[PDB]
Amino acid sequence: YYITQVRKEKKGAGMAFATPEEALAAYERGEVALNAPIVVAGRETSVGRLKFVFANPDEALLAVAHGLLDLQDVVTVRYLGRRLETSPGRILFARIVGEAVGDEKVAQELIQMDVPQEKNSLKDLVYQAFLRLGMEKTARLLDALKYYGFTLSTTSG
Amino acid sequence: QKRKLQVGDKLANRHGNKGVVAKILPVEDMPHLPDGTPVDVILNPLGV
Amino acid sequence: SKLKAPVFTATTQGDHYGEFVLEPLERGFGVTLGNPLRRILLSSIPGTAVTSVYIEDVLHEFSTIPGVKEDVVEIILNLKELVVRFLDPKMASTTLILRAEGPKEVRAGDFTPSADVEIMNPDLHIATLEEGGKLYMEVRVDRGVGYVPAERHGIKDRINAIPVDAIFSPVRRVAFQVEDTRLGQRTDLDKLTLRIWTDGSVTPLEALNQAVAILKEHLNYFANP
Amino acid sequence: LKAPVFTATTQGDHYGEFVLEPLERGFGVTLGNPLRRILLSSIPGTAVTSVYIEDVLHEFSTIPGVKEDVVEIILNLKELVVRFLDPKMASTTLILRAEGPKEVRAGDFTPSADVEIMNPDLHIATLEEGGKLYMEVRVDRGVGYVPAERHGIKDRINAIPVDAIFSPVRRVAFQVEDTRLGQRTDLDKLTLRIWTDGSVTPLEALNQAVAILKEHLNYFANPEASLLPT
Amino acid sequence: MAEPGIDKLFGMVDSKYRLTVVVAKRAQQLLRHRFKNTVLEPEERPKMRTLEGLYDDPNAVTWAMKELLTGRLFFGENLVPEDRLQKEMERLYPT
Amino acid sequence: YDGRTGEPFEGPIVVGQMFIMKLYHMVEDKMHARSTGPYSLITQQPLG
Amino acid sequence: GTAFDQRPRVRVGQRVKKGDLLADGPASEEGFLALGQNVLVAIMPFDGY
């Protein structure tokens, strides 16, 4: 859950835009001088979708591997094919399932992509995995979800 | 016999938190305070 | 203490991605080695990547060049996925010139065929332009350490050039695990499996060997004054 | 990157702060943990491996005129820390000739050629009128935590083997602070700590420790089976 | 990573329990004739890992399952008589 | 601080001293393994 | 099977408390019911442990 639950801060709202509120650069300059902290809704975007633009999931998570973002931050990121607005951790989960099932893609179509995962979604996932992939892989997926769940619960502290 | 703890002993507090020892961790692991002291038991919160 | 010195297997791919297993090991040293290594791995293995781009006719991080199907960002990101290595061993930085003709697909190899610089991944999509296609480019390539993004440095060269995120770290992903192998009466001895992911430039075995040298190099400093 | 500066603030035969002033960003924990770990576990020292008490035939006994009782005594002897001087040495026997109405006190042990009890005071026994005490306590060298029910020392009949706490290292902490040194404002200041019983010395330990990390590091050396399905 | 391709196995049979009954009987004949029975022999044979390494996997059950999914084997409800299927089995080094 | 990797667990942890007891039941007194042994002369199944 | 035993808690020669603890019980520390130990605890998950 914690690993896919998009942070939503408050300070700021006199901000985002369809047409650029002030300058795209100047908006990005708002977060600098305190004023309007990252992943906060304004109009069409958040500052967190502009300060970060990752070319591959790798970039994004390596970015979280140093002090930069948090996982539950909301960032522009191109996964597979398309600029996604999602979160590093949302991305992570996506790989976890893909990567531990032998088809990054078929996961991306089994998953509930932009929503936190919890008791029901995951059950559904497991079940709906059971269907298009036999026990064999569902078990792998099972253990994989088991691992991160645990380790992610700890590290999140 | 002199016994000592073991993996499968039952420990409980007066508030009714029972449970069995599943893992004795060497001191290297174990969460520790900055001053150096490590803790002695790691009790899962979900049981609260 | 008993037992014996361990075995180091390394089932390898051949450019990117390596597996490495230091097998039988005293109860603990799986993390005592794997962890510090992981750290250094993603953080100090010297590399070389794009740092600043100027493109003719209009600037800003967000725009659309007419005649070009993509938009400045998808160019800028594509750029980041470009791998290149430095031949002349005292090179500090370079600039890359791209001449883009009419209706065409522009690859990374459609860059200037300047030596001292071999383009590792020349079958990259860079950008695509329609008819009457004008796109001129001048991108700075730079030697660096970790992941140093565009916000911090602010690489100046021209005034219409926009600085990019700098991913100079030939390792793009590192992950390790420490299970436990039986050894006679003993069922609980540690087994460390490191898994590296790199680009073109540096092989994983290289990465690791560099990484081990670095921490080995630092431990030295701990010597009475 | 320059070069870092090693500063050591060693006080007694125990406790010593150790610093490296300018280290590359992130490199604090990088170094000062595998260090802390190796330190907490693999520096070797000394422990009371087995006892023998006068007219005492097992662990669950009680000596006349001795307040204590053999378990409480064994529990105390556990805490005694002996220094070895002769590196030729492997194990010896301290002798507790103790008498009458007095308070026994560990220092009361027999003085031995190349041996140094670093914790005088520390109660061994309260003796009351009549109480005779004669003891023989073994002290082996070893690493880590090897307990009685494992090793069992057979120094003679009715000896009792005791659990062994071998590690001289007592507590280890490391602080990753912000240093000021004419580069960035993003550099670590690793200051390792360490604590002992005056047998092994904070530095002596810290040294022995890196040596272990250095050798274990040296293991990533000869690559074996490769050629993965490509 | 459960059993060697277990989903592909169920598919061969009409009822779950058939797979169970065959895998048994094949391991049963495999066991008697000191593995000199194999239909997969060459470098397909299943193996272990030790303080040495790469020694033949002792479990007859395992063998049947890998042997079964090479198609080579033929199981049936009633073709070939048992009283004459017992004797003819001793052909290439028996029990 | 995680003893295993010098890093912290992001987000503080509640820590303190707690009274806990070790209980009547021990793994020592539970747990057996049988393969073959004394079968009864009455019932003819394994016991004794 | 508990193994109950008494331990002395007084000094050879001292004035006594009209009835204060002369000797401890089995679950007793200084005449205060001691049924277990106090110890430093963390409240967090570990690794499924």
From Swiss-Prot, chain A:
It comes from Thermus aquaticus. DNA-dependent RNA polymerase catalyzes the transcription of DNA into RNA using the four ribonucleoside triphosphates as substrates. Coiled coil: none annotated. The RNAP catalytic core consists of 2 alpha, 1 beta, 1 beta' and 1 omega subunit. When a sigma factor is associated with the core the holoenzyme is formed, which can initiate transcription. Belongs to the RNA polymerase beta' chain family. This is DNA-directed RNA polymerase subunit beta'.
Curated annotation (Swiss-Prot), chain B:
It comes from the Bacteria. Belongs to the RNA polymerase beta chain family. DNA-dependent RNA polymerase catalyzes the transcription of DNA into RNA using the four ribonucleoside triphosphates as substrates. It comes from Thermus aquaticus. The chain holds residues 829 to 876 of 1119 of the full protein. The RNAP catalytic core consists of 2 alpha, 1 beta, 1 beta' and 1 omega subunit. When a sigma factor is associated with the core the holoenzyme is formed, which can initiate transcription. This is DNA-directed RNA polymerase subunit beta. The gene is rpoB.
Curated annotation (Swiss-Prot), chain D:
GO terms for molecular function: DNA binding; DNA-directed RNA polymerase activity; protein dimerization activity. Coiled coil: none annotated. One of its GO terms (cellular component) is cytoplasm. Its EC number is 2.7.7.6. Keywords: DNA-directed RNA polymerase, Nucleotidyltransferase, Transcription, Transferase. One of its GO terms (biological process) is DNA-templated transcription. It is an enzyme of class 2 (transferase). Residues 1-224 are annotated as: Alpha N-terminal domain (alpha-NTD). Belongs to the RNA polymerase alpha chain family. Homodimer. The RNAP catalytic core consists of 2 alpha, 1 beta, 1 beta' and 1 omega subunit. When a sigma factor is associated with the core the holoenzyme is formed, which can initiate transcription. DNA-dependent RNA polymerase catalyzes the transcription of DNA into RNA using the four ribonucleoside triphosphates as substrates. This is DNA-directed RNA polymerase subunit alpha.
UniProtKB/Swiss-Prot annotation, chain E:
GO terms for biological process: DNA-templated transcription. It is an enzyme of class 2 (transferase). One of its GO terms (cellular component) is DNA-directed RNA polymerase complex. Pfam families: RNA_pol_Rpb6. Keywords: DNA-directed RNA polymerase, Nucleotidyltransferase, Transcription, Transferase. It catalyses: RNA(n) + a ribonucleoside 5'-triphosphate = RNA(n+1) + diphosphate. InterPro entries: DNA-dir_RNA_pol_omega, Pol_omega/Rpo6/RPB6, RPB6/omega-like_sf. Its EC number is 2.7.7.6. GO terms for molecular function: DNA binding; DNA-directed RNA polymerase activity. It comes from the Bacteria. Promotes RNA polymerase assembly. Latches the N- and C-terminal regions of the beta' subunit thereby facilitating its interaction with the beta and alpha subunits. The RNAP catalytic core consists of 2 alpha, 1 beta, 1 beta' and 1 omega subunit. When a sigma factor is associated with the core the holoenzyme is formed, which can initiate transcription. Belongs to the RNA polymerase subunit omega family. This is DNA-directed RNA polymerase subunit omega. The gene is rpoZ.
